[PDB]
Design an enzyme around this catalytic site. Structure first.
Site, PDB file in Angstrom:
ATOM      1  N   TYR A   1       0.823  -1.208   0.000  1.00 25.67           N
ATOM      2  CA  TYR A   1       0.000   0.000   0.000  1.00 25.67           C
ATOM      3  C   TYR A   1       0.859   1.261   0.000  1.00 25.67           C
ATOM      4  O   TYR A   1       0.578   2.232   0.709  1.00 25.67           O
ATOM      5  CB  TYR A   1      -0.947  -0.023   1.210  1.00 25.67           C
TER       6      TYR A   1
ATOM      7  N   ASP B   1     -16.772 -14.169   4.790  1.00 20.40           N
ATOM      8  CA  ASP B   1     -15.334 -14.011   4.759  1.00 20.40           C
ATOM      9  C   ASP B   1     -14.838 -13.924   6.203  1.00 20.40           C
ATOM     10  O   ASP B   1     -14.941 -12.866   6.836  1.00 20.40           O
ATOM     11  CB  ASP B   1     -14.966 -12.760   3.959  1.00 20.40           C
TER      12      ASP B   1
ATOM     13  N   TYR C   1     -14.062  -5.245   3.337  1.00 26.04           N
ATOM     14  CA  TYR C   1     -12.773  -5.487   2.711  1.00 26.04           C
ATOM     15  C   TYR C   1     -12.616  -6.976   2.499  1.00 26.04           C
ATOM     16  O   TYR C   1     -12.871  -7.757   3.410  1.00 26.04           O
ATOM     17  CB  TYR C   1     -11.625  -4.947   3.564  1.00 26.04           C
TER      18      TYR C   1
HETATM   19  C1  LIG Z   1      -6.675 -10.178   5.223  1.00 24.94           C
HETATM   20  C2  LIG Z   1      -8.012 -10.400   4.572  1.00 24.94           C
HETATM   21  C3  LIG Z   1      -8.263 -10.965   3.220  1.00 24.94           C
HETATM   22  C4  LIG Z   1      -7.180 -11.425   2.268  1.00 24.94           C
HETATM   23  O1  LIG Z   1      -6.058 -10.568   2.252  1.00 24.94           O
HETATM   24  P1  LIG Z   1      -4.616 -11.131   1.792  1.00 24.94           P
HETATM   25  O2  LIG Z   1      -3.873  -9.826   1.659  1.00 24.94           O
HETATM   26  O3  LIG Z   1      -4.859 -11.830   0.464  1.00 24.94           O
HETATM   27  O4  LIG Z   1      -4.104 -12.040   2.864  1.00 24.94           O
HETATM   28  C5  LIG Z   1      -9.582 -11.100   2.794  1.00 24.94           C
HETATM   29  N1  LIG Z   1     -10.637 -10.756   3.552  1.00 24.94           N
HETATM   30  C6  LIG Z   1     -10.539 -10.224   4.789  1.00 24.94           C
HETATM   31  C7  LIG Z   1     -11.770  -9.859   5.582  1.00 24.94           C
HETATM   32  C8  LIG Z   1      -9.195 -10.022   5.366  1.00 24.94           C
HETATM   33  O5  LIG Z   1      -9.017  -9.487   6.593  1.00 24.94           O
HETATM   34  N1  LIG Z   2      -4.180  -7.373   2.844  1.00 25.84           N
HETATM   35  C1  LIG Z   2      -3.953  -7.713   4.257  1.00 25.84           C
HETATM   36  C2  LIG Z   2      -4.245  -6.508   5.135  1.00 25.84           C
HETATM   37  N2  LIG Z   2      -4.611  -5.315   4.663  1.00 25.84           N
HETATM   38  C3  LIG Z   2      -4.831  -4.371   5.605  1.00 25.84           C
HETATM   39  C4  LIG Z   2      -5.207  -3.100   5.406  1.00 25.84           C
HETATM   40  C5  LIG Z   2      -5.396  -2.219   6.468  1.00 25.84           C
HETATM   41  C6  LIG Z   2      -5.185  -2.695   7.754  1.00 25.84           C
HETATM   42  C7  LIG Z   2      -4.797  -4.020   7.916  1.00 25.84           C
HETATM   43  C8  LIG Z   2      -4.629  -4.820   6.865  1.00 25.84           C
HETATM   44  S1  LIG Z   2      -4.166  -6.464   6.784  1.00 25.84           S
END
Ligand SMILES: *Cc1c(COP(=O)(O)O)cnc(C)c1O
Ligand SMILES: NCc1nc2ccccc2s1
Ligand SMILES: *Cc1c(COP(=O)(O)O)cnc(C)c1O
Lengths: 425, 427
Positions: free
Chosen positions: A18, A244, A147
């Site tokens: 990011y 999720d 997310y």
């Molecule tokens: C961390 C996360 C993912 C997948 O993120 P990655 O970066 O691919 O590990 C998907 N959904 C949710 C709700 C998450 O917290």
């Molecule tokens: N793609 C894995 C994660 N993405 C994020 C974004 C914001 C805060 C915590 C996290 S963990």
């Protein structure tokens, strides 16, 4: 390499999450238990991993049970292709996952990351309706604030306006969004959700949500009764329900899975992050026998996905150990104690001028501030107090390892409060 | 603990396998109980037997299984730091691997974005390409172009550039992004093909962010080879029409085609490059996306700002540590001679298949050997035949092929090729 050389190589060649290139990370040199060894001004310092390394390290770093599970498997078989072969770590893990997840989830698809497991869940949902002869059911519905990862399908159900993927909306699949789900239960919200779903039902493959806690979208909590309403609505309008649980799984919210707060079973479920106890990347998508069979008996005859490192024996072996370690202790009492420690420790933040809310759910503690948190101020303030904190947006939050002692939780909450105090300074 | 029978029972009830069904797999998976060197220990009719991993476990196991140097690197890292978040922190394994990869990849690739799988690295490459053109104020440049026969992974964006037949694009109608496909690149060099590619690209240039191809060898889409000179043409075409060039070397990387990276056969550098599979020597999932200084700084100077990607396990210290060991092990030997010898062994061994009735082609490129047949290969027949001969082969479609570990002896290559020839004979 020395810490100085690591910084130089990093600056020249490493893209961080990011972030932009060229417009400084802290060197980490060891991790044991709840503690990281970081280099600050050329000297090693010990700090608490208050973030559990992005919510993964639920048993802390270098746990003897997990270490030995990895080295034992390494001695036997590092990896074999899952095409045409199977093996004990995959079987043991799948059996464990089917038994501890919400009732009805009977099949397991392993992948290597959360974002991929979300794409697999979507593919399952789409292929399911194609199997039922209803290919028009191809859209997803969710509520705002969500997310689900960074791959292009997962991006399409990220919050369109406040979400990190907002600039991409014009090239993403256009999905259906209900308003932000409120914290307190309001039947009017559920009624409106149903009315919106109703007019799109013939084009909706699935509802996809994070149950109870929305993580990367803003650490927002909602009443578990909403999930009961979602399950009812999805059942009546024949829309698949997808949870999720990649952030919420394995005890984080005080239940084994957040779905358990509502006694709800989805049709499809994603897990990851804490699945391996933070050792290695692994994720899994589970679905009901009905979904699996409808896909399998479809004109496709097969779920068309198969990652190279699918069901990697090393990742599966450490995951088995991590899940067994969790189940073999009184994890519920442990999490309740953590939650109590977070609640007590963050209470004084409620009075701070820059603080708009304080909320705790299991081993999740959040201070919501009235302005975006500046990392240039927050990071050293936390490091000065022996704590690694990583705020985002306007949130100072912690998701501590479950092995944190009460004293360690107090240290963590103290640092969070002082970060919040500095925000309004 | 689980016996092989209990494993089969659990597996049949609860485990999805790649590109398969639950409940109606024609052939049950075989239980693997160990792997060491070039050899797998499999359970056949209750008996553990050792068989050669002719596939390198899907291209990954280039140093074989349980190589002492790689095992050691992993356990060494495990004792100090299993994993930390790459958000705000960095570490020696990431830095060491990044430095290695920028030094050995084609010239100009100087920034590394780590991810957790090949498919994700392809998505990261596409995001880079799209964000690049946004950074140039040309957001209309948002489509991808490729040639047929390709494979780039299973996530939905990766699927959109997979061969429309191989990825069964009829099942996903309107679901997938509509990309631009040039015809199947031929094996032999024909300048007419490149001129035609150019003409097709030209009409789409204002719409195109990137050309994405597998250089020299197209793997999962059909084990097809093409003359490296086509890549020289793509680099030129992309330069003149202002379209980025992305090489997906997730299958071809780390020596497999006889060059360290397949791009090196053509002496060209792409703008963006994906690597994976053999990156970790087949121990752990890891992939990387590299790009040029221009790409990185155009993204970073764009009003859009940061590249919004960040896998939770980005730059995992364990996976990075073993990868460093795997790459150093490759570079610390005369790998070029090793691959040339493997290629010679494959060529010698597969020669007799060329006269078989069912066989339409035999081809070898580096440590890759292929027998193409005139009909699909039956797994229920081919698998016991191979196993009887001490070899684990996994045919697909009409292809009997192998990509053996670089550590295979001449005798082992003879065993593998004889098994392939016999499978072809039974076809
Ligand atoms: C961390 C996360 C993912 C997948 O993120 P990655 O970066 O691919 O590990 C998907 N959904 C949710 C709700 C998450 O917290
Ligand atoms: N793609 C894995 C994660 N993405 C994020 C974004 C914001 C805060 C915590 C996290 S963990
Ligand atoms: C194997 C492969 C991928 C995908 O890698 P996964 O780890 O299976 O996601 C992408 N591109 C090419 C060329 C490959 O060979």
């Amino acid at each position: 390499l020395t810490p100085e050389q690591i910084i130089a190589v990093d600056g020249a060649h490493l893209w961080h999450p990011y972030s932009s290139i060229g417009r400084s990370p802290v060197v980490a040199v060891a991790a044991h238990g709840a503690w990281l060894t970081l280099i600050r001004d050329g000297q090693p310092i010990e700090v608490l991993d208050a973030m559990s390394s992005w919510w993964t390290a639920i048993h802390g770093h270098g746990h003897p049970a997990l270490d030995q599970a990895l080295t034992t498997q390494l001695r036997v078989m590092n990896h074999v292709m899952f095409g045409g072969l199977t093996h004990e770590p995959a079987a043991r893990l799948a059996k464990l996952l089917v038994d501890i997840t919400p009732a009805g989830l009977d099949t397991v698809f392993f992948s290597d990351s959360g974002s991929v497991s979300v794409e697999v869940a979507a593919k399952m949902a789409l292929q399911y309706w194609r199997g039922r002869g209803l290919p028009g059911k191809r859209r997803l519905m969710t509520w705002r604030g969500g997310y689900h990862g960074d791959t292009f399908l997962a991006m399409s159900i990220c919050d369109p306006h406040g979400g990190m993927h907002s600039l991409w909306t014009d090239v993403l699949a256009a999905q259906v969004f209900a308003p932000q789900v409120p914290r307190d239960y309001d039947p009017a919200y559920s009624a409106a959700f149903e009315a919106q779903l109703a007019q799109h039902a013939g084009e909706l493959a699935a509802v996809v949500v994070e149950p109870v806690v929305q993580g990367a979208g803003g650490m927002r909590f909602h009443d578990p009764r909403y999930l009961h309403d979602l399950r009812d609505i999805c059942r009546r309008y024949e829309v698949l329900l997808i949870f999720d649980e990649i952030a919420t799984g394995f005890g984080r919210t005080g239940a084994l899975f957040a779905a358990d707060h509502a006694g709800v079973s989805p049709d499809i479920m994603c897990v990851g992050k804490a699945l391996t106890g933070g050792y290695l990347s692994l994720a899994a998508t589970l679905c009901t026998a009905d979904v699996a069979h409808t896909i399998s008996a479809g004109a496709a005859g097969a779920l068309m996905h198969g990652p190279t490192f699918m069901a990697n024996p090393l990742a599966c072996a450490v995951s088995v150990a991590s899940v067994e370690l969790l189940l073999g202790q009184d994890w519920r009492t442990r999490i309740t104690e953590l939650a109590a420690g977070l609640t007590a420790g963050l209470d004084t933040a409620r009075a701070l001028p820059a603080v708009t809310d304080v909320r705790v759910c299991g081993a999740i503690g959040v201070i919501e501030c009235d302005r975006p948190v500046d990392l240039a101020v927050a990071t050293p303030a936390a490091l000065d107090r022996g704590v690694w904190l990583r705020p985002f947006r306007n949130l100072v939050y912690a998701m501590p390892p479950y092995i944190c002692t009460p004293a360690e939780i107090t240290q963590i909450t103290s640092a969070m409060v002082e970060v919040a105090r500095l925000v309004g300074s």
